[model samples]
Target: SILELKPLTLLMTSSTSFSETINQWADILKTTDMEKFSFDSNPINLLELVKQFNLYVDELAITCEANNVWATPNLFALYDNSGGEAIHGHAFVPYYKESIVLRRLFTVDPNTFNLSRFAAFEGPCQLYCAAHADSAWVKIQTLLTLGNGIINTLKIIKQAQAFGIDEAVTENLKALKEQFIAFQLAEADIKESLKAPSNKESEFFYPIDEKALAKMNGYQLATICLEELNSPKPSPLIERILSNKKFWKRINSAFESGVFKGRTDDPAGKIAKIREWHQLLQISG
Candidate 1:
């Protein structure tokens, strides 16, 4: 029963990023002469590879959202209103299910929440707003939904091909046609899924712990700092720090220390570029 859980073995194409690593494994799988093996078979293992790819995508989205590389308005609103503190709406709402009053209290007034004013919030509120601005989560969610539909369509197509279910058997023809329709529907559905709102409460803004927020913020700030530092004319302090090894080390240490400490007081809002990036990538994917 335990062994049954093992995934099926399927060959996959090499990843562009790690061609050497994949080639090495392919060589081992093909008994050393890499050239002897066809490009079609290199131990890619689609099932596993896709799963890993999805996870990487998810993590990347998460990292992007956390760092404000992606913009999510609803999340920003939630964070800004929460007093610059990132509250895990997902976790918080579930806990208050037993009390309607508590639910009403925590429920935000979206009309009053302004993403542009996120920076205006002071102290903890600003922090909350910043964390909420993460839009990567929404992008990842959209991607995963689309990916699932595509995978399902591929499975059906593969099954039909394997059975040679083309015209020979009337039932097979009917089934194949049905699958074709399903595939088309899935394609449309994925397109629609891509259009789905990222800032919707049900999708991206969920309750998370303070530790998670801190971890996310640290990563976000680090990215921001790096970007700024790389600019043609960075802040004098930033340039100085970049040049001073000792200061850079200290600042880097400080940045690392703030990661994942679970601070609830984070600013919220979506990063604009991140949102655009999500839309672009989803269309491509």
Candidate 2:
């Protein structure tokens, strides 16, 4: 008789629903000591498992990178009922509580999965975070799986070193472990960012447009002019200033007072002076 571990499979299928088994699986995740567990499979098998996890993330339309949804943490919430009363040999029940728009798409009959739902989000980053949240629980499981894979890969490399494994095989296993760890770090980075403090609207939602520009201070306008001066194709505003002595003097004064104030031997200051001298020659000629 051969003892065997359960093979990895996609948790969600076309027939998948809010099932009792899903809840029990979620329970295992919370109760389990994930870091202490290592995959009992070979390095090659572990690689396949990681590949499958990567594909699942790709299918979710989420990524390991920081996204817009990350900025609005209030929108994504996961509830764990793993410790609650178990029914029919199952306990781990995890569910997602998303935004109202997403609730309409995920909860209502005939599940509305479409680009329009993607539009329901304010931006692409929002859409990604939305997807991330929808699968946030599933992502938790996959992250643990990859972590266990890394542990197993490290163990396999050690075994190869201590045993009769060939140099080529050990080298391949080391590279494989690096790949697995890199992917795990990316996954963990995004997961960790979700726990950080959110930048609220009042603090970061200020507008920057034509209307705002008109209200900018003298220093702000001068800084913009200095920025434009270095461009290969300077703004029309720069040319307009070229023929206006009053405006040019005001701008130059602001530059010396604000930007180059109390500064000499700075490369930027020297270059700006050179540009200023050249522009002055243009006015004289």
- Candidate 2 residue pairs in backbone clash: 23-92, 23-93, 27-92
Instruction: State the lDDT of candidate 2 residue by residue for 230-277, as single tens digits.
Output: 445544544443444444554555555544442222436643754565
Question: How would you encode candidate 1's per-residue C-alpha lDDT over 34-142 as one tens digit per residue?
Answer: 2222222223344553454344444444444434432312222343333222222111221111112112222222332311111122222334434644333333333
Model 2 global lDDT (CA atoms, 0 to 1): 0.38
- On TM-score, the leading prediction is 1
Q: TM-score per candidate, in order? A: 0.26, 0.25
Residue 137's lDDT within candidate 1 is 34
TM-score (C-alpha) between model 2 and the true structure: 0.25
RMSD values for the candidates in order, in angstroms, are 19.5, 19.5
RMSD of 2: 19.5
